[PDB]
Each structure stands twice: as C-alpha cells, then as structure tokens.
Design a protein around this ligand. Sequence first.
Ligand SMILES: Nc1nc2c(ncn2[C@@H]2O[C@H](COP(=O)(O)OP(=O)(O)O)[C@@H](O)[C@H]2O)c(=O)[nH]1
Length: 159
Amino acid sequence: MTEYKLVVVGACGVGKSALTIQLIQNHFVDIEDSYRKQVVIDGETSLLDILDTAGQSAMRDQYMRTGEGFLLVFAINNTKSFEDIHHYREQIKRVKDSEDVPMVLVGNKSDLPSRTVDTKQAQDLARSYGIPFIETSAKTRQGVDDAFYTLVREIRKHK
Ligand SMILES: Nc1nc2c(ncn2[C@@H]2O[C@H](COP(=O)(O)OP(=O)(O)O)[C@@H](O)[C@H]2O)c(=O)[nH]1
C-alpha cells in the first residue's frame, strides 16, 4: 500500500491544523501537530501521513526532506500570510535540493467576508510557480478534500 508524506506549511493562524483536522476527523471547532489516516483516492488506497508546521527544529528539517508534497497555505484575510508564501516555497526547494517538488497553493478561510488577498493575486502567483490553486474553508469544508487529493495527484504525476 502506498504512503504519502505530506507537509502543510504556512504562517501561524492561517488554518493548517483546522484544514487537516477537517480532512482527518471530519469536524471543525472554533492540539495535535501530526495526523495519519488511510483514505481512498481515485480508487487507490493511500495512507496519508501529514505534518502541520509554520517553521517556528530537527524534526522539521527532517520532515521537509522526506515530505513528498507540500500545501502552501495562506488565509484570504491575512495579507502577510500571502506574502510569506514565497519564503516557504524557497525554503522547501533549498532543502529538497530540487526544482520539481509537488506543491499546491491553498487560500483558506474562504467563508469569511474579510478579504485582503484577491483571488486574482493568488491565481497569478500559482501560475508563476506552475502549481494548482485551491480556495478552501476548514469551517464549511469547501475545497478541503480537493486540496489534499490534488496534492496526492501532483505527487503521482511526479513519479
Ligand atoms: N472562519 C474560519 N476560521 C478558520 C478556518 N480555518 C481555521 N480557522 C480558525 O483560525 C484560527 C487558527 O487556525 P489554526 O488551525 O490553529 O491555524 P494554524 O496555526 O495554521 O494551525 C482558529 O481559530 C480556527 O478555528 C476557516 O476556514 N474559516
């Protein structure tokens, strides 16, 4: 059976944990740093081993090296978190020592009316990196499966 090591990166408070909890435990409440569950994606059974991190040591650099795919998460009501995305992508590329690393850009908190990051901005950035962009809400579950499953699919095309 296939195991996919995924890493969810992004600034503090963007909803990395909420997204992962929603995926794995199917709920949202307004504490675990890692998660593990077997799911079926496009008919293939996959064990997802997922780490949520903001980069703020030995475990971290380790999980980056072996992480096979990365969700780059920002919140649509957090301009700084969007600006931080470049730093996260560059850091990953450095540690992987590679230019073809599976990634997906995730704009979370899409249910909220406060928006300071335009969808156009995010789409343009994703196009530049050559990766998918998915709008999500850990609260409503919008895009949650799609974000993670799309990443798994990026990992497959990569191999
Ligand atoms: N409204 C809304 N709140 C969210 C969403 N995702 C996370 N949150 C809230 O944002 C806060 C920080 O989320 P958290 O998962 O701890 O962020 P993390 O530091 O990236 O893991 C918490 O109060 C969450 O309930 C979302 O999609 N919508």
